[PDB]
Every structure is written in C-alpha cells, then in structure tokens.
C-alpha cells in the first residue's frame, strides 16, 4: 500500500492523467 507501483491501480491514477498528453492538449487547445 505504501509503495506506489506504476501502471497498476484499481482506479485511474491522477498522476497518469497529469502525465497524459490530454493535459498538454488542453494546454495547447488554441493550437487545435
């Protein structure tokens, strides 16, 4: 429980969404 293992959670990880390209896509929504 205390060891945050990557890419294996029951629920979607907040850090996964932060590192996901959707974050920069929203940041670069003007470029879209």
């Amino acid at each position: 429980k205390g060891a945050v293992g990557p890419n294996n959670f029951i629920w979607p990880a907040e850090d996964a969404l932060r590192r996901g390209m959707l974050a920069m896509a929203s940041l670069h929504s003007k470029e879209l």
Binding site: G2, V4, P6, E14, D15, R18
Partner: protein
C-alpha cells in the same frame, strides 16, 4: 485579482512521493518546493551554505531522537529570523511542523535565551498540506442566519390573517 487564502491552500506533489516517499528525513525536503516555504527564511540560506561547503511533551522526544535535528539547531542558532522547525511526528502518515520566528535578544539585562514567537500553523496529513477558528464559527453562524431568514420569510408568506380569527395558515 482573486486570491485563494493560504490557510485553505492544499498542495499535492505525486512525483515527489513517488520518487522519494514520505519520511521524516525528507519532510522538510518535501516542504521546500511548496509556496508556503519562504525563500527569505534562513533555512534556505543554510541550504546554500551546506551546498557550497559540500562543493568546496514530545518536543524533547523528537529533540533526542534525531541527529539531523541537532544539526538544525547548531546551524540555526547562529542565524536569527524566520525559520522552519518540526513540531511533532507520528509515523507513518502524520507530521506537523512548528512555524516560529526567532529574535536572539543578546542585550544586557535579559537572562532569557533567544525569543521564539509563533507565526503560522501547518499540518502535513498524508501527501497534503493544511494551514482562524473564529472565521469558521462566524461563517457557520452567518450561513445559519441566512437559511433561517429564508425559512422565516417563506413562513411569513404562508401566514394569512383575518380580523375575526387572528392569524391562521
């Protein structure tokens, strides 16, 4: 420009806890990058001094438990001003720091040591950070009063009067 009060301000650093993890050894290291850590505090000055040198009830318990805390006094007694010190720790999830400022009044006639004065409250709960109860009480009371006003105006709207009976519903 609208500013969120720092008392309710809550910082989360998933990358830091993923890389280093939560521990009393690096709790100050975790706090360093937060907005609450003032860059003008003498702790940062001590940090650059250490970096340059390398390149070139429970208060007494936590006092005697750790040697880095010792090094914190012997590096902090020389510099007076705003400094960050640990308040208490219960593992493996709860840490609180003690936000105090020091004025080493070495004047003649004062037999006391350096003056220590509180400035703020900071609570590290899990990976989150929390920072007046008077405001809480007044806010709760005023919202209660607003709801009471709404209820009473609605009830008075429901009220109907006749001279021959009095007031009825």
């Amino acid at each position: 420009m609208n500013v969120t009060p720092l008392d309710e301000l809550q910082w989360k650093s998933p990358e830091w806890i993923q890389v280093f993890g939560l521990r009393t050894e690096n709790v100050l290291d975790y706090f360093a990058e937060s907005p609450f850590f003032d860059k003008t505090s003498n702790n940062q000055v001590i940090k650059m001094q250490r970096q340059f040198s390398q390149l070139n009830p429970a208060r007494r318990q936590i006092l005697f438990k750790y040697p880095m805390y010792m090094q914190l006094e012997e590096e902090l007694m020389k510099l007076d001003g705003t400094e960050y010190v640990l308040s208490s720790v219960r593992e493996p999830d709860f840490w609180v720091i003690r936000k105090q400022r020091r004025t080493n009044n070495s004047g003649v006639g004062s037999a006391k040591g350096p003056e220590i004065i509180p400035l703020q409250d900071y609570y590290i709960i899990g990976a989150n950070i929390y920072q007046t109860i008077f405001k809480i009480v007044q806010s709760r009371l005023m919202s209660t009063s607003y709801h009471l006003n709404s209820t009473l105006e609605s009830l008075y709207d429901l009220i109907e009067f006749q001279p021959s009976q009095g007031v009825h519903y």
